[PDB]
Design a binder for these strands. Sequence first.
RNA 1: GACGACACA
RNA 2: CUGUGUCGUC
Lengths: 104, 114, 914, 68
Amino acid sequence: TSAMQTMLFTMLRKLDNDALNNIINNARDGCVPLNIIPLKLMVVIPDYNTYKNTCDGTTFTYASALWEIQQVVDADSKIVQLSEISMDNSPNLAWPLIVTALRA
Amino acid sequence: KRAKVTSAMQTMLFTMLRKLDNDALNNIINNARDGCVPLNIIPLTTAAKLMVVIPDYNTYKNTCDGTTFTYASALWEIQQVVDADSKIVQLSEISMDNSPNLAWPLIVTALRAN
Amino acid sequence: SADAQSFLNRVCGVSAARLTPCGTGTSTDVVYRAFDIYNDKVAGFAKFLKTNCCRFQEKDEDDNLIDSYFVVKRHTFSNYQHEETIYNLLKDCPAVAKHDFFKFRIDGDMVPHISRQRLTKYTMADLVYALRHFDEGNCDTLKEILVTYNCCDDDYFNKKDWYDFVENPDILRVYANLGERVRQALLKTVQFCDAMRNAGIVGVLTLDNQDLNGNWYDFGDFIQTTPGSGVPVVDSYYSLLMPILTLTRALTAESHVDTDLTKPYIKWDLLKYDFTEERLKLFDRYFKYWDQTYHPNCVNCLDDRCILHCANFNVLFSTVFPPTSFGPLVRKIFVDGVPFVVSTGYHFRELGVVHNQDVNLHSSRLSFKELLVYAADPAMHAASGNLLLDKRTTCFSVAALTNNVAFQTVKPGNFNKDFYDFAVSKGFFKEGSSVELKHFFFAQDGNAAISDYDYYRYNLPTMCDIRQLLFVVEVVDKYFDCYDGGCINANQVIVNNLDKSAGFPFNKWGKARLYYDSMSYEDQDALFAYTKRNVIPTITQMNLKYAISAKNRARTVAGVSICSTMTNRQFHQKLLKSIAATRGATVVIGTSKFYGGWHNMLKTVYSDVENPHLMGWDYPKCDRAMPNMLRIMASLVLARKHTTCCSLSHRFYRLANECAQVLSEMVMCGGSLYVKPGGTSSGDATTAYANSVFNICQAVTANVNALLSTDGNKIADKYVRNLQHRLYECLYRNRDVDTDFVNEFYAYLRKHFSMMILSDDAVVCFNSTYASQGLVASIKNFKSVLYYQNNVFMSEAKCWTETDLTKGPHEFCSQHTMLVKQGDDYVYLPYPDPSRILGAGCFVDDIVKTDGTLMIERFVSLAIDAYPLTKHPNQEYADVFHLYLQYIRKLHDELTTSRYWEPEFYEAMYTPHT
Amino acid sequence: SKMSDVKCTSVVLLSVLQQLRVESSSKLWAQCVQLHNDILLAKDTTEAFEKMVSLLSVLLSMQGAVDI
RNA sequence: GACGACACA
RNA sequence: CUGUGUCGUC
Ligand SMILES: [Zn+2]
Ligand SMILES: [Zn+2]
């Protein structure tokens, strides 16, 4: 059970690829892709202190490629426009926010 | 070692014989010329339930549309449409736009409508 | 000039005066028209160079050339008068191109000549030829037959792979579009044969004397007698035409109301299974003059040759009747006054209708053998199961047994034990190495077993050439003389792996050991006697297998029931054990690549060939494609050993049992029965030897069609010409058997074609000069034989011709061969692909077999077959086995002369025993 | 040397995927096995990386193991 | 011979 | 699944 997961994590920390560790770090600090990354992506961000570093406007750094949000979703299903994120109106929602991006 | 397997085969035969000693089969064998009919017609003519496997939406459209379709020259009323996950699928959820949202192989089951 | 215009207006005569000067006024002698000639000098079905033709052409309206030629020849007065005197008899039937004999002076003075009427451009002989001798890059008169007859378009060929079968199967439709034309040809040949009989014309009918429009011509080989008596010798025509009657489906229009392709399909009665009167009418319509008694059923035959004949006819005659009437027949057998529905007969696609004989209503109880034969039929199973319509496949669905279909997934294999840490430690698997791990345990999803079983869609109805098969069988049985055979009793049988799957439904209660131990010897022998007089259909559970491969395809293995294998073993064990226990013959099964085995095998293949060059081949989808007639041929060749033990009726019932049990039986893929169109069920008891028989059949057929289709006027030898003469004569004349020439041809093959045939994979050592002069077969003669007999296409990227002898076979049984030196004894060594070896080492089937407890014996059996890598000049190949031995020693250490730490073990497994 | 380890880690990825009863669906398991097959049959170092990170996205879409 | 394993078809 | 060969105990 845990032996396969252990071997997988070791020989993932042995490959040492950029997008690989990117995905692993984002999954470590909360960012989980709600579906399978196509080659239309959805990710959850359980906080905001670890979000300022990844996305900025139409630019979205994930999977070592560029992404671009089209509409943001919150817990209560409202379209949070991307200038609502501030240090004052932050705790007015449940932190899982769906980000719907697209490729180049 | 021997009584067990003999009883197994015997009760298996006499059990599949419960749903086999009906009157439709006796009717179709009473019409043959010498009491001998091919096997491929027995289910096709007297089986009282149809099971059609369907890989995608295009074959569904022209095989199991509506509720009453005709295979083997008889009316069949559809009940309990299910998909590859053994999950019940309503007749409304089978739409062209939603067809990429459900499992590919369905299993539509009908009953012989008299 | 004016002479040419006079020639045109003179060849016209009564037809349209708008012919086109194709070629020249003189004989255009168009090259390379495949003839079918037989005289005292030359014989065969070859492609000689025509010299007398002058293929003029009329143009249709709007100045468009049309498919109609007038073949103006330069005949002499003798044959001219002969042809006129045998054409005035036949000027009334339809199948006579209006020869239009006349005269002129084409030399300046006094020269006679003939001028045909509206035959075609290309000939029926060309159709049959270009369909048989298929070349992937030379088929020019096959991209025109398909086009000039509206069957397809020109741009269909710019699509690469346009000709294949196992990929792009729409070519089946493009070919079948000629079915109506071939059926018109059959009709017209019958209205000609009967017009000759009823008019007294004794002679012969050949292929190149017909034409695609149905017309006939060249009425010179006849001779006149008292009218009303003359019979035409029509063996050659029908024989050479047969193999394309099921490639174009010339009987696709008998399934209609008035036998035309517009009315609706016959609303056949569901409860009709006999069809023997319709079979007699089919024969009286299409083969009214095939001069041998054809029995509709096959139970009324006379020997295995009559069985081949009648079954080969029925395998085409039964593509008309509805597929809802084949398979078992059922009856209302009463038990205690309760209606059972079991099999009281069987309708075969080839063997006709066969009825049981130990059938009896009103039985008071049932015994063990009776319960077995009852619960083994598909009757009680498909009579109480839900009707099924499976749209995932094409095979005729029968009855879903359970209430929900079942999907099964293919797990992925384990990987990366410490035998990959060590492999990457010891300088392997680095940047672009000579070897790279390229053998994995691939995985498949749920929808895999059914999509793989669907590969029976390449199995088609095939009508082999019967007058050629009835000689290839004798040559094969000559290949099988040195083996003893015959029925054995129960006590004399030997069973290995008594704990495998016992088939459906028998697998619901135990393994084959259960039945073999429950049944007594008398009971087994009585079941055998019963099956020698009665037909028992059974069910084969087809499930997925789990092995390593370099592709991602799935591997579905089939397991036949136990009441089938239990009798097939008693039938065939003697002959199979005898094939296995003999060395030095053609069929090499039961050999041993260790202890000089490879070396001795390769020497025996090099036995005494004069100018040798090796060869090899592989049949794509061999099991999914092997036609039913070739499988029946193999069954009969295996059964030929029974001559003092079983009568003809016993042996026919055994052949029908074998067919109904393994060839076209009920296959339960998933949770529902299906109709298996044919092929070889992997779980067959005799499949590894039926494949050998089929292998030799294909090779001998390639040799026959390489020795006949060669221009006998260009064979420098003075003996091969006569051998080919007598070959064609024993093929299409002399209905009896000719042991003299069969012996001599088998000797010719053994002296110039040294086969080495383990099941489905062979290597040959042919005389290169002969295989270059066309006296024996090549890959160009195996590809064609496959394309017209097995209905596949053998790509030349998996067939290797080795122009050297020092380096051995490129690949036999997946092993390579490297001529090595064992102390001044230069011998051959079998070495495998190091990628495959490293893959087998690293991975493992499932995770219970990690080499941790006592499993070093897994790693020793890899260096036992990967030793010769150490003798390869490439240093990395040697380092493969050296790494193997190093980590085997490390395994032995961490686990703390058969010690597997020194290489004095693998060195012994290749030097002879003493 | 960045292709053999990639193929083997893709194999162990599909193994740990099935180990979570993910084989109880049609679309998900079909796409996962297609990813694994197209990784194994690959030679390029980049396409294998992309299909690997897609398999890892699959593995992290659920919540079976996050931070050991 | 009984069992297990590996390889080939 | 059908076999063929090669290794390990009693
Ligand atoms: Zn016969
Ligand atoms: Zn016999």
